[PDB]
Design a protein around this ligand. Structure first.
Ligand SMILES: [K+]
Ligand SMILES: [K+]
Ligand SMILES: [K+]
Ligand SMILES: [K+]
Ligand SMILES: [K+]
Ligand SMILES: [K+]
Ligand SMILES: [K+]
Ligand SMILES: [K+]
Ligand SMILES: [K+]
Ligand SMILES: [K+]
Ligand SMILES: [K+]
Ligand SMILES: [Mg+2]
Ligand SMILES: [Mg+2]
Ligand SMILES: [Mg+2]
Ligand SMILES: [Mg+2]
Ligand SMILES: [Mg+2]
Ligand SMILES: [Mg+2]
Ligand SMILES: [Mg+2]
Ligand SMILES: [Mg+2]
Ligand SMILES: [Mg+2]
Ligand SMILES: [Mg+2]
Ligand SMILES: [Mg+2]
Ligand SMILES: [Mg+2]
Ligand SMILES: [Mg+2]
Ligand SMILES: [Mg+2]
Ligand SMILES: [Mg+2]
Ligand SMILES: [Mg+2]
Ligand SMILES: [Mg+2]
Ligand SMILES: [Mg+2]
Ligand SMILES: [Mg+2]
Ligand SMILES: [Mg+2]
Ligand SMILES: [Mg+2]
Ligand SMILES: [Mg+2]
Ligand SMILES: [Mg+2]
Ligand SMILES: [Mg+2]
Ligand SMILES: [Mg+2]
Ligand SMILES: [Mg+2]
Ligand SMILES: [Mg+2]
Ligand SMILES: [Mg+2]
Ligand SMILES: [Mg+2]
Ligand SMILES: [Mg+2]
Ligand SMILES: [Mg+2]
Ligand SMILES: [Mg+2]
Ligand SMILES: [Mg+2]
Ligand SMILES: [Mg+2]
Ligand SMILES: [Mg+2]
Ligand SMILES: [Mg+2]
Ligand SMILES: [Mg+2]
Ligand SMILES: [Mg+2]
Ligand SMILES: [Mg+2]
Ligand SMILES: [Mg+2]
Ligand SMILES: [Mg+2]
Ligand SMILES: [Mg+2]
Ligand SMILES: [Mg+2]
Ligand SMILES: [Mg+2]
Ligand SMILES: [Mg+2]
Ligand SMILES: [Mg+2]
Ligand SMILES: [Mg+2]
Ligand SMILES: [Mg+2]
Ligand SMILES: [Mg+2]
Ligand SMILES: [Mg+2]
Ligand SMILES: [Mg+2]
Ligand SMILES: [Mg+2]
Ligand code: NA
Ligand code: NA
Ligand code: NA
Ligand code: NA
Ligand code: NA
Ligand code: NA
Ligand code: NA
Ligand code: NA
Ligand code: NA
Ligand code: NA
Ligand code: NA
Ligand code: NA
Ligand code: NA
Ligand code: NA
Ligand code: NA
Ligand code: NA
Length: 254
RNA sequence: ACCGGCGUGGGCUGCGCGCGAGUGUGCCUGUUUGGACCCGAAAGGUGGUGAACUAUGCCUGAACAAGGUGAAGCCCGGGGAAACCCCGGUGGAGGCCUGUAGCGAUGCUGACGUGCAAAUCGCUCGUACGAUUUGGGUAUCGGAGCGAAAGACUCAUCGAACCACCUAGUAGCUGGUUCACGUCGAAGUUUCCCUCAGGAUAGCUGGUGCUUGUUAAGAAGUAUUGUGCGGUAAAGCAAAUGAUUAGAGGGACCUAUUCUCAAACUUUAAAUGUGCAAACAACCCAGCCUUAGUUAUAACAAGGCUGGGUAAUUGAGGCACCAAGUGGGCCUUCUUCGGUAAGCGGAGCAGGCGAUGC
RNA sequence: UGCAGAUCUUGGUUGGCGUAGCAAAGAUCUAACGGAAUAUUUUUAAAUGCAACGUUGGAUACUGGAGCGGGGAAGGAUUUCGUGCCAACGGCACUCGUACACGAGUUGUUCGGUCACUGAGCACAACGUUACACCGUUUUGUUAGGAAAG
RNA sequence: CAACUGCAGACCGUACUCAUCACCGCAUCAGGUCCCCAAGCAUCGAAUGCUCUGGUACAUAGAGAAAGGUACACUCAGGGAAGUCGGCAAAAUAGAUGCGUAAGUUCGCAAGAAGCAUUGGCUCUGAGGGCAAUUGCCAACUCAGAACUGCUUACGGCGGGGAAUCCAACUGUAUAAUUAAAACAUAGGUUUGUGAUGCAUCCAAGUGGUGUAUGUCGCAAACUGAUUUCUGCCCAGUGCUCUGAAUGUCAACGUGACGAGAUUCACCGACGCGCGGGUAAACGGCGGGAGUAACUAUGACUCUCUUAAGGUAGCCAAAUGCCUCGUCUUCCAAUUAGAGACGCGCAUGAAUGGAUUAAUGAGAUUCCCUCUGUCCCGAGUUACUAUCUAGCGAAACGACAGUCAAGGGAACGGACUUGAAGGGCUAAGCGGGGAAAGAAGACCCUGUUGAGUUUGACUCCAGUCUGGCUCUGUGCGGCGACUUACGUUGCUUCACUUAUCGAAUGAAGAGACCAAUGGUUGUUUUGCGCAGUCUUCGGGCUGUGCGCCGUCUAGGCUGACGCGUGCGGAACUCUGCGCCAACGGGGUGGAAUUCUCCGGAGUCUUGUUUCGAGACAUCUGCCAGAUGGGGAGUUUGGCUGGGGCGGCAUAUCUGUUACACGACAACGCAGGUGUCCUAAGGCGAGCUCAGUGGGAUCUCACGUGGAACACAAGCGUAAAUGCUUGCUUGAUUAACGAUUUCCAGUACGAAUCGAGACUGCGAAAGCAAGGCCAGCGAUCCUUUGCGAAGAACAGGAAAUAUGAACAAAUCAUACCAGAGGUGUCAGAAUAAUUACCACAGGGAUAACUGGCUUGUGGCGGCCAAGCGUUCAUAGCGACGUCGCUUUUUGAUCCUUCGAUGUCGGCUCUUCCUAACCUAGCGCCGCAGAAGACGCUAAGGGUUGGAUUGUUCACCCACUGACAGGGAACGUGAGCUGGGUUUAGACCGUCGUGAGACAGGUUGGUUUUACCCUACUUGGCUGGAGAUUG
RNA sequence: GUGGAAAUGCGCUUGCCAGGUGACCCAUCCAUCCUCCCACGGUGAGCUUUCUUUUCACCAUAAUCCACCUUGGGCCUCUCGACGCGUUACUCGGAGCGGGGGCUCAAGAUUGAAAAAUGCAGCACUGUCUGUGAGUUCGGCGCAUUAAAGCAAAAACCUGGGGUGU
């Protein structure tokens, strides 16, 4: 047979992201001496839209700690951020929306976004529209903080990791029904080459494990093993259960 | 060399010996390998060249007559206690409608069908502000790429492109195979084979002979005489086994009969057949020899030595070596099995055609 | 080392046969001139030199501005111009020609490009891998365990 | 620095074209090819028609009413779909204005729904504005109205409409060159994996690559397919999964034993499997049989079998129903069609989605109005051809040729036999034959040929998971295990950091100074005691004490200094200021401020850029196990009245076929065989069986086998070859003895006659090395038995041989005799599918024509029991028997596989008779009328429609009548293309799957005549020895 | 350096830093240049059997520069508003509407230099024009509308903050 489409995407030839009109990665400030001992003050100058992303971004302007020049940064904006607002980043910063603080200085039960998983990662968790994390507890003996992730899982991080205060802007996006195939065309024009989608039963046996037959059907169970080789791993991968969920659903993930 | 059993025993085995026949070379024929008498696959492998056709993404440019309908927002009048509800304008939305250019290709199953054309032409037809059309640049390819998915397309080449090479690939299968005369001249049958369109093996044929003979040596698809073998035709059921009709004499039963039968019944039993013999490497008689065989021993067995006497009519007997083609058959007489039958299928004996005219 | 056939190979010849045809895009006529292409007869004038070509004037007509108009890119590369010429070629014709022959023609401080920008992207150096560089990385501010500023 | 002035301004391109002749299509080819400029009138106008400027008369022409054609050309009386598979094609509607507009609906639409009226020309009137001082002057065509007058309904351009059923929600895409669709996509719905040392995944490989410039409102992987209303039961099977490893089983690595060692054994040993849970919007599945209610009929009710569960809500002869043209209503004169109903439904049914749906559709189907040359039934006209001429000028094909009838023949002759025609050359047509041309048949079969695809085929490879070793270091504790309680050791707990791994940063400020279960051999000279124990006599090691390394500090408390806290700290308070290349101060030296250092700006480094994890990872390498159509390679018997399914005629035994020696075939007939038996083998003795009759199991007589002998059958046997009984192991060994059957005079199996040893039973002669003939197996490999102990001064008639430099003990190997098996039985290791298909061939072999046959089909004779009011025969005629035909279907396999175009209809000619009508006769159960039967007769005739692709059939009508057949099942270079029978797609059933179905459904290129003959017309010209004598 | 109360006007050099131009292409409406009609006039040809103060053609001004009334937008000042201003159109105003007077940007208009010395038509010389209406993407409304669709980048150039110089 021929190579399956799932394996062809790993070459990434015509399936890479469309990033010509993007603005760059959206990161926090670099963790330096000033943010570990005091605070830095910056001004929000612009709030802008990036194709392919649902959350608006903010351009913040700081002063260089050591040189006579100005530094411009690009971050994911929390809700309520406005142009002209003052941003404070550091250990000695107060607790307000849009400020960046170490996780150990934020009171339990507070809503945060742009959380660092490692000290210096510059933000990796809760970055999509309307998403946030919750601070559960602190442990001063070991210096670890426990959070609740948007997916429902719980994760422990060092207390020196930084986070923003508030929720990510642009929430409520998926509540509006797309109505036309034309609207889905423009949604994926900024992301990548992945739409429209052809069903596997509608292909031929040379292309997909589900192809062929005088009727359109799968002749074998769709649940496949975790050990299946590439080209065989299609369907529902390593599923613990199938069918309609009745009652409370367990937390997804490992 | 391998043994058995208690001496000048015994019985198996060798591509053994038994007064050598080999060896070198020339030439022809057969067996085998190689391109292998000549030409022919669908395939398989290695290394390269293509996205000018066409598929999809991206960068930067260009284009889309004339009409219909009339969404939000806005203005002014009315009604109402409130909540709010009505008329008229304005405005110009939509993967909206009619319709050019553009982009396509439904029907005539029209024209042409050695064409204008290796897919074109004429009317008619779909859509025509959008998931729209298009130039240049750029990015992803052959056990691969790409695909709103048709096994679509990747330079007239795709259920796996093109170029060169391995490669004169293999073919139990199809086609071909070039002078004359002369001497002979078949087979389609047996056994074994993943064998059934092919082989090996025996038979039929040719060549080369060897040993001999001149009336017959170990002669004969034929008779005679003598002496063996047989259960088919016929016959039988008043005889065994099986089937079966009806009366008679003592409803069954018994006795003697009676009609009608048999590839897998038989007392009897042909014709046509089929073994053997009818002499010289033999027989008959006489006198002897030997033995570890037989017999209680004259007598038998077996191998020898020395002298006497001995069924027509046709005619060459015996023995090797090497090799070819063939291994689809068909018809008729008589005897036959299956089938309603067949210019049907399957056998026995003989003669034919094939191979042959007159 | 001998050929009659292998849908055999390469040349040549052949009936069919002066046959099938040369039918989309409407179309030409007239006088004078040119030309070897005439007004060609010795055996009144018509019934014995037909048919066809170019230029100019006149007539008639088509394209009908999404044009058989006037300029460019890709591609072509002397097809451009003048003079001459009619063997072969323009599936009829030619005195015509993008044909043949001989000579000519393309002029920039300002026009287009380079000088002198970045884009989708490419891949020298350096490093790593590979039996073998003819391999990989090389724009998310950006090469290289990295001393790359003259 | 702004003016002016002087001088100098490099390189390459530049002609022409951009297309009905300059480019790509073999060409000056009706195909294709990007950009700019774009006039007047009609008109809504870049529609369409005509014209000024610019550009062109270039595409072979002349003459000219044959047939038949093509057309971007028309018209037809009366009827109006009667045509056809089907209204295909044509006709038809049409602009604008005023009025008017239904069911249904997601309230947007449907809608231009449907339908009605007006429209020319001419002469007038009104309304709709601007600027200057009520006046004056001036511009744009739109709309409304009136009088008069006219029509031959009169350019171009420009929707036909309505009522329903099926499918898909819609716009869109899509097999370039036969399929545009119901297929794909879509919005909506559901499920799965996953928190980055992640999930999916590329590469031969690395500090390599993609989703990821990302972060659960994300990314990756599936299924269904708008909205509305719903989505039932089943976890037994297969799959997936579990935070159950609890126990059984297992590989390397490890740990111990016997042995001299190779070897051998024991223990330990992970995931997985097993066991036990979960899961169907995972693959999938979702029952039978009796009885029963006041006429019958049905059965709410009962009983009984049985599943993992027994089809729920819905829907239906539906694109799914075989029977089937189901049954009822409606639509027509008539309906295998359509709609509405009914439902034990071969074989409907719920995200393998069920039901319903407005709007939309070059989708499939039925009816109605309008309209028509589709038809009754054809006729006339135009332009270009064909036809004749001038110029120019091919191809395909071509054994040789070209009149028929019958015969036989390879079973359909141009050539052959017999007969009958035949005059030379010829122009325009035509499509009967040349089984005409085009292509080494694509259907079917065969070959020890392939390829694409699948999986529970055979043999394997990546990937994933798991164990061991290595990478790999330092300490503190526990549980064991082994050696006399101290030494090694395997598991582990905890604390570390330097190997290693992850991340960030332009390696941009780590830690301490706050002081120890720190070090103190130190950049330029810092060590000092005590105790114990060693010494090479110089001084060390261990444990303890004191010094030194070694030290500053914003702020906040306490009484300008000390002492606790603090740990590098001076920052204005929901919305946008500047901030840089040092001021000052201390010294050194030179002067009246110039150079240097030190602070401003805290010191130090047993040293790591900083964080996280950390001796583990799954970090590197090497071994080991499991899983693994993701991938690679290969295979997937034979015979056969084609092949397949079936069967075994594939190795074998009896009777018969079989024709009186022997041999003899069929998917011929009737039956067997792969076993069974320490006795059912061997021998001696005694006895007589099956059955019958007479007497109360017992007794007597008869009894040729009519019983028995393991089994199939045949043969054989009576003081026995049978039965009972006693003793036994001849079912052992048997020096390579010979032979028969099959047969090649090979093997294997079976069997016969013997020689030797030791025996059994018999008083002996004698019988017995299985049970009589069917009951079984090569090479290579594996495995067992025999070559016991001694004797020999030497390998001998007597001691098995070898391991090749020689010796001791193991081990391996040879020679002889058996066993483990090949049933395809003279003996490869083996699953499917192809309609996407390929190649070499086969008329050795099927599907269509033809040929033989005639069971079956059809059509008739002979006899006469009966029926016919009595009466065999007016008319019929059973039980029997004799034929004919080739118009049915079978049987066969002769011709054709380098191809003979395969159903039906349309058109047209001809032949037959077994006679429906028309002609002439006879007879009747023939009064008249109307009919039955029979004979001679084939001259003439035999219809229009509804449903269906049909042939056939069945209805409605007319008629004198609406007969049956043949001609290659007449007729495709005559047509048409509805059916059948490729590739697309949907349903039902079947299959794990790819796929299958002579089940249903929808869409799907019909090529060439100019040659010979035949036929139809059209002309020229010879010929009497049918050219000569 | 300097003028004005203000909007802002007129006449030495940049190690470093910060802005701007480049730079983002619109239905509708208005609109330059341009071409197309009309009205008046000049010049030259055409028809004339009969009519036609008639039919046809032409009537042109390149770049560059000087001086300084219309339209649209931004702003200053005085008087300080609740109803008021304004578009075909979906607006706006004590965070400052409207009115008087001004500063400024963009697109046009007008006078002049160039330039009649040129060009055109007729025969050496003659003539050598303006005003209306319709169409048309330069420019303007930093424009409406879908948007889970919402600014390509850089060289080069311009100005300022500081500093230097006078
Ligand atoms: K939000
Ligand atoms: K042979
Ligand atoms: K309607
Ligand atoms: K279509
Ligand atoms: K979906
Ligand atoms: K289950
Ligand atoms: K299960
Ligand atoms: K359609
Ligand atoms: K013909
Ligand atoms: K014996
Ligand atoms: K073999
Ligand atoms: Mg990228
Ligand atoms: Mg498909
Ligand atoms: Mg597969
Ligand atoms: Mg389906
Ligand atoms: Mg070859
Ligand atoms: Mg192979
Ligand atoms: Mg439309
Ligand atoms: Mg056609
Ligand atoms: Mg297919
Ligand atoms: Mg041959
Ligand atoms: Mg002879
Ligand atoms: Mg022969
Ligand atoms: Mg020759
Ligand atoms: Mg001709
Ligand atoms: Mg014209
Ligand atoms: Mg043009
Ligand atoms: Mg010519
Ligand atoms: Mg052009
Ligand atoms: Mg052309
Ligand atoms: Mg008009
Ligand atoms: Mg027009
Ligand atoms: Mg036009
Ligand atoms: Mg008519
Ligand atoms: Mg009809
Ligand atoms: Mg039609
Ligand atoms: Mg209504
Ligand atoms: Mg209407
Ligand atoms: Mg559709
Ligand atoms: Mg097609
Ligand atoms: Mg088509
Ligand atoms: Mg039904
Ligand atoms: Mg149906
Ligand atoms: Mg009908
Ligand atoms: Mg129905
Ligand atoms: Mg369900
Ligand atoms: Mg179903
Ligand atoms: Mg459509
Ligand atoms: Mg004949
Ligand atoms: Mg002719
Ligand atoms: Mg063939
Ligand atoms: Mg074979
Ligand atoms: Mg495979
Ligand atoms: Mg077979
Ligand atoms: Mg036996
Ligand atoms: Mg045959
Ligand atoms: Mg043919
Ligand atoms: Mg034919
Ligand atoms: Mg024909
Ligand atoms: Mg199934
Ligand atoms: Mg007020
Ligand atoms: Mg007030
Ligand atoms: Mg003002
Ligand atoms: Na499938
Ligand atoms: Na399905
Ligand atoms: Na050869
Ligand atoms: Na060869
Ligand atoms: Na074999
Ligand atoms: Na053959
Ligand atoms: Na043969
Ligand atoms: Na780049
Ligand atoms: Na559309
Ligand atoms: Na679909
Ligand atoms: Na039901
Ligand atoms: Na029906
Ligand atoms: Na013809
Ligand atoms: Na065999
Ligand atoms: Na018959
Ligand atoms: Na019959």
């Amino acid at each position: 047979g021929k190579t399956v489409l799932t394996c062809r995407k790993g070459n990434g030839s015509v399936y890479q992201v469309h990033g010509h009109k993007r603005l760059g990665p959206a990161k926090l400030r670099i963790l330096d001496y000033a943010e570990r001992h005091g605070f830095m003050r910056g001004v929000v100058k612009a709030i802008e839209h990036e194709p392919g992303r649902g959350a608006p971004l903010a351009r913040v302007e700081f002063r260089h700690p050591y040189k006579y020049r100005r530094v411009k940064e690009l971050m994911v904006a929390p809700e309520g951020m406005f142009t002209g607002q003052s941003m404070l980043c550091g250990v000695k910063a107060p607790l307000a929306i849009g400020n960046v603080l170490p996780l150990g200085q934020i009171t339990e039960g507070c809503i945060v976004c742009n959380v660092e998983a490692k000290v210096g990662d510059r933000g990796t968790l809760a970055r999509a529209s309307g998403d946030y994390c919750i601070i559960i507890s602190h442990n001063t003996e070991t210096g670890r903080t426990r959070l609740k992730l948007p997916s429902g899982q719980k994760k422990t991080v060092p207390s020196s990791c930084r986070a923003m205060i508030g929720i990510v802007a642009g929430g409520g996006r998926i509540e509006k029904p797309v109505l036309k195939a034309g609207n889905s065309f423009y949604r994926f024009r900024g992301k990548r080459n992945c739409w429209p989608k052809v069903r596997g039963v509608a292909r031929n046996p040379v292309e997909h494990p589900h192809g062929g037959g005088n009727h359109q059907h799968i002749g074998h169970p769709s649940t496949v093993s975790r050990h299946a080789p590439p080209g065989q791993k299609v369907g529902l991968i390593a599923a613990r259960r199938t069918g309609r969920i009745r009652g409370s659903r367990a937390v997804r993930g490992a």
